[PDB]
Amino acid sequence: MDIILGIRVQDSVILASSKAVTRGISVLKDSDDKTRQLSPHTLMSFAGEAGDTVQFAEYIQANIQLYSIREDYELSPQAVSSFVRQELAKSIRSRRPYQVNVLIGGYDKKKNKPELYQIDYLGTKVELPYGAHGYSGFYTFSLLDHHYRPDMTTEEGLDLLKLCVQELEKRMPMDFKGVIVKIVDKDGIRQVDDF
Amino acid sequence: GSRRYDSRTTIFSPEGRLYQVEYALESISHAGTAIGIMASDGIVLAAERKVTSTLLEQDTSTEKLYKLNDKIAVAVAGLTADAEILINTARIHAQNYLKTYNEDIPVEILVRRLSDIKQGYTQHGGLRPFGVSFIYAGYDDRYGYQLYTSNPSGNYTGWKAISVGANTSAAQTLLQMDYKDDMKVDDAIELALKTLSKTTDSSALTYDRLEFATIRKGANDGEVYQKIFKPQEIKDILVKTGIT
Amino acid sequence: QFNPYGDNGGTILGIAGEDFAVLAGDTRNITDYSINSRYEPKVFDCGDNIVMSANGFAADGDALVKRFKNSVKWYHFDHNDKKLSINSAARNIQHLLYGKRFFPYYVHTIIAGLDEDGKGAVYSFDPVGSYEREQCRAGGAAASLIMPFLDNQVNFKNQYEPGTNGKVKKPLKYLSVEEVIKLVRDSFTSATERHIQVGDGLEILIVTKDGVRKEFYELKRD
Amino acid sequence: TQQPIVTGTSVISMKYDNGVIIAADNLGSYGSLLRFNGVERLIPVGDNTVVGISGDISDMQHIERLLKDLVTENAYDNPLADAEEALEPSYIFEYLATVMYQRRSKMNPLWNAIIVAGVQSNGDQFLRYVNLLGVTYSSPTLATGFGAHMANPLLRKVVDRESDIPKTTVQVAEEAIVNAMRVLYYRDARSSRNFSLAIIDKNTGLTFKKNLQVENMKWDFAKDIKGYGTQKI
Amino acid sequence: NNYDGDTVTFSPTGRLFQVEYALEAIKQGSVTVGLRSNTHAVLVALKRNADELSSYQKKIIKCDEHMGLSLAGLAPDARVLSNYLRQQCNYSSLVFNRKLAVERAGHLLCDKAQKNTQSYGGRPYGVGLLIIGYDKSGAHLLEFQPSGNVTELYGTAIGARSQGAKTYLERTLDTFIKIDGNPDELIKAGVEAISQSLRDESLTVDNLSIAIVGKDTPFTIYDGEAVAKYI
Amino acid sequence: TTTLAFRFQGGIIVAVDSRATAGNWVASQTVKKVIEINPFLLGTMAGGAADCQFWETWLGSQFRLHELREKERISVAAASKILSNLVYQYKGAGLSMGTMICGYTRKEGPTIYYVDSDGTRLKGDIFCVGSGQTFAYGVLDSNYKWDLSVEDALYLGKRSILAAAHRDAYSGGSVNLYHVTEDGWIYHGNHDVGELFWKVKEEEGSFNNVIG
Amino acid sequence: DRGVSTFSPEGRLFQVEYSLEAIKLGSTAIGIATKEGVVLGVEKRATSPLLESDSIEKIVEIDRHIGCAMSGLTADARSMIEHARTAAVTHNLYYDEDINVESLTQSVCDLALRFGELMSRPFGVALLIAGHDADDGYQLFHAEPSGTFYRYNAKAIGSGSEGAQAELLNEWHSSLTLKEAELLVLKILKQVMEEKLDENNAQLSCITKQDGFKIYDNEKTAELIKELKEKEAAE
Amino acid sequence: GYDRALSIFSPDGHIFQVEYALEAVKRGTCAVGVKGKNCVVLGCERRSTLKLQDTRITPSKVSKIDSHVVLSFSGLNADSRILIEKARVEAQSHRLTLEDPVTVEYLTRYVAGVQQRYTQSGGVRPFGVSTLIAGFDPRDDEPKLYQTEPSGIYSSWSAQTIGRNSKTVREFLEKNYDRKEPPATVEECVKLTVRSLLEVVQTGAKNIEITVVKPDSDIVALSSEEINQYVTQIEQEKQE
């Protein structure tokens, strides 16, 4: 767990998440997918303490899937994010809190608009055009301040994302073994296989 | 021990009926009639107060119609005290949903949870059921305008027009006769009052023996307004439809 | 601040033969630089031809032996007087120890007896319950002194056949009860010489199909 | 988690041919202050057992109450309470040993070291130790605190092993105990001159001696000692 | 009649009918005998079967090395009470390093059965027990009834047709009490005692059940070919 | 410890050492670090000896109960997740476990899961776990191909443990080999490093750092 | 009304006695014990022809060395089996060995009387527990809701029990082979069953030391039915 | 807490509360389940004494437990919601721990276990509900149809019906359903289901609901016009 990014463009939300899983002086795996599908038009990436991340992500996934079956209806990205924030806001004052940071990228079918939410382990939610967790932000935010435009296409967003990964690969101390990129839009969630 | 004095409120009859639920419904049938009618551009809630006294304060009174949130209201038939217990629960449940999802609760979800509470009192706990039937009138962005009813059994169903309490048999026949799908609110207001006027056990229907409410989109642009009618506003609407 | 643990010293030793098994232990009990008792036994007959010792913190040691002895008693009640096999006893002891994983029994436990084929068996446990059957084990204060000697003399480690250019190993064979007791006595006299917490007396418990015999030998009292 | 406040020092004991002897001084110290002087730290249970206690005195008084209550409880529905079903030393010890270990296991110990001395129904001598940790052991001679360091060496010269017990008379045994109490007065900074002594014999029974004093002390040589090296006056 | 619905109700004449109905279950149970001398104490029990294809219901239970009982009535209730005795015998050993007195064993059973007769919801135990043991005051024999009443005796018997064996022991009292240092002769007397309660059936090899405890004898049970000596 | 297991053309290879230590004291050279959960499931043990040994034995009881209830052998995924959910409940309490759940089923095929005591659960083709994991990785990675034969795969697993047994002070004793196929696991013997090192040195010509 | 744990004037628990009546209404189950093994067989009794009979599970595995057949309110047996399986596996975990058949039965029977005003009523199902261990060999037990269990050489429970038990009295001897015992269960089942016996409405099973507990296929039982009919016609 | 033992045995060995719960099921609207060669169809009756209903929002008779399993019922409506909710939760819990969706047998076994627990627990009455649970196991094309009842017993059925006048429609299915050759197609299976309901219902207008379940989470509910076409076709063939 380390690098997770997110960029909202005109018609979609793009999430990028590192593939490395390290423990001690060994990279145990270089093909890890740090994301779970909460619903057909909502995707959540995660990063933080070992174990806590997947345990939390799947617990949210189970709850949203339960809601979908009960009501035969998909919750809005705004509604899902608020549920996630509350769960983390409870967590922080528990005996042992979840130390997990998440990005929620979704497409609201009623508004026909893409939405990106950034939530930290304290339960601090913000909607953003572009977001990042961990040390990644210290490079990517200033970069996106310069190059980002609100009316960009998905293809323009992927090039903008390549520009971030290149910078991270150049200046980050750790080898994070590249990223898995996923796109969220009106047609649902799909993975870019060649990045 | 105490076994001797137990009524066993949550058991079946030989015929497969729940004694207490059936008897609670019999209680509700003597309560003041309450009607709900759903139109294309709004909903009407009308209810008859139980034999009023001339020295009852009418303007600062609430017996039949209660507000659950900004988008949902209920009409009551049965024990008022029992209904208020359930109403405060429903109000809290709506605020929990808003706090969790930052969105107003869908009407059916609120109704289901309130109905599930009633069900619990018929299956376990050894307590008597709530002697209450509700008419839920509300709006959300999924299904739009909606009418539901729930009863002591914890069973709920959806309606275009419905009555609870006294003389429902006669009232439901009259609604079934004059109701049509392309109906407006103002027409539904007239139907609600005309139906009560014919099914009432009183000599004549007057302003002081009624509670009335509408849920329109009659506010400014794409938003819902709840109107709980004042005494003078009921007096005027009663003259305007030619009942008095 | 209160410290719930202490060190009562002493050392124990288990060896297994073909049709027998021994479990020895010195009789000295200590705290810091003082001797508490010159004869305080810590090897016990627990029934069903099972001998047991739990060396280290004597209070935890006594508590454990007490609980296992009780476990044997209730095994008879609940399962029609069935004999508790040495392998079953070991697994039961694991659960006793691991039951206090987060407030452990500070002891090294060793049991000895015969397996279900009649052959000699020795099991050893760490403080939190990990166990292993072996031909040979020393435990306690002088375990680090005695154990390598046992590797050499019981399992013939690092010993090759003379003249075979270090190619053929010395073949493994069972030891007689006479030869095993010789090794036990020599192990404890050696440990007494070089470890301060070891001395006073030696008590050996031998286990055959006939039962549980005892032997006692004096050790240096300094 | 405790810290001991009012404390009692050494308890010493040994076996002899027909029974056991135990002793302990009558002091209740408050740190360096020798606060209380009338404190009895030997407590008899029945006519066949004596429990000697060192360490925290508040916890000692609690244990007194438990033993007092144990005698009461044993008498209930027991026609042979003063005969076959009387409290044995071994019963009294095991009870205390159980309590001590349970309290240490709850991280709230009775801050004491205890020696149960007595004679069994079959005539056998009983002598066993237990402390705040729940640690137990038995030996021909037993002692607590400074007694462990200074008394045991002297008492072991009389009874060094099991075979020396029949050869040791009550006269010889008491003499050694009284001597040890004198040595402890010389050398233990939290000890007093006044002490109590108890003998439990299989023939003559329980003899409890109060208000004893250390006597026949050697102090005369002190007058010759001058300075710390090179002083001549 | 109207006063037997539960155990919490007294009748107008001061009777507890549920306790009396529990006592009735014992009378339906198979016969068992208890007797003792000064050195040993013996339990003899007639076991019962469902049919020829079934086994014979075990009547005797061990509680400690020095104590055990025989049952008559609801067997599961005997298992609950015997288990409680095993724990109490065991508590006495671990805490006080002391073998539990047979008299205290009776007192504890009495007080356990009593609590079940004074509270709503519960029910009385439906079994009678004969407890034998050897402790610091010699050999003992107790009789437990689920009313709570426990009684120490030289000899006794409970179950169906127990009056026959109880009369025999009342005659033989002076003889069998002095059978000291002779186990086999004390058993023979117990086997002859239970034989006074037999009708149509006789004592066979897989029918009889004997148990003994004494001075230099731990509590042991004999079944099968080990009781062929006494037929 | 040093333990590994890797996936290849002919199934799964699993290899472990047999040493147990208490600080610098070598406590045992003959520890069984592979648990045979059932004829189709294996579990490896690294870290706290009691923790691993107790919970992986408990693990086999849960899996037995699954096939009794469901009339079907438990999946490798479900098996590994029971363990990971268990240790997650004890997170922070101080359990020390580095395990690998290896086995074959019809629906999954040959599968390996890494599970550790801080709650990490990972599916993968190659894993090395323990204090000498890095030494094993060095040899294993540089010689690994998917198209290895059963004979060559068995040797590479054995050789990788030997490499770590040599360099890592807290690994050694002997090598235990296992091969997992569609038909189940097959034991491929206990190999003492005492004889194996010299046999490998002579025949392979490797280990030139050592005085021959 | 009246208490759940009440005694009758005859000295029996009302609810326990009433539960025994429920068991008499249940479908027949038979068990026979031999030196070569123990056989268990049951009547399935489908309420309608549309019901897929293979889904009727009235014979059940507890461990590899212990099997179980039921009769009465079969839904009540689920939690009894669950307990039995846990008890069996748990004992293996604590003691690294198979658990005695008698000890398993006793653990199940301890649940029986844990009812009152614990669960609200006794179990309405009887169990036949068959198994093997090293000490007492091949065994068959009958476990009731009273908390009582008897070992049996052979035993029938259910609606046709008293008629089947009388038949087992005559037919059983100590030298019965396993094959002989299999046919004997089928023979006696066909006698007491309402509908005609075949492979679809009756089920066989056994437990042997070598192969453990096995439920027979419908193909295997069908051949044993055919072998049975031929042998009766042969004299 | 309320402790009373409501479900208890009677002298003749019956638990009346469980048997009276079956009467509540007998009162409920009819429900039918028929499984074909590659599908299962669930049919349900809706009583026509209720006009002025809003069918958009009124709770549907067939409920999805997961994307691959459905549950229909007969009996007390309020009771059915509690079982459905518990089943839906258990469905997500199974996916979370076993990493695989429930089998239809497992889901049935769970629901049946819940129903049984309420027959010997203090302070509660049995569920006045019988269920038909149908669907397809993960990565499997064999159709599954199970039935449960208040007592807690469950079993698999080639075809089955429950509710009021269920003994009439069971009689119909028993002669019209061939084990050797089940309905080969979707159309054949739906027709047989509609035919069986037409023996009992009244009119084939807004009284019959049909839901078709196919392998790999392929579930769809038929509208009025689509069902009405089956009703029109069957009646024309009948006049012969």
Ligand SMILES: *[C@@](C)(CO)[C@](*)(O)[C@H](CC(C)C)NC(=O)[C@H](Cc1ccccc1)NC(=O)[C@H](CC(C)C)NC(=O)[C@H](CCc1ccccc1)NC(=O)CN1CCOCC1
């Ligand atoms: C390689 C070999 C080393 O990392 C492996 O990882 C192996 C795994 C195998 C054994 C399954 N790990 C060990 O050998 C492991 C290392 C270790 C030790 C302690 C904590 C974590 C990891 N060793 C053990 O677990 C030893 C095995 C015994 C000696 C056979 N056990 C101990 O050290 C025990 C238990 C430690 C403990 C853990 C948790 C709570 C309480 C205690 N401790 C002692 O025996 C104490 N000590 C031994 C020396 O003699 C004095 C007492």
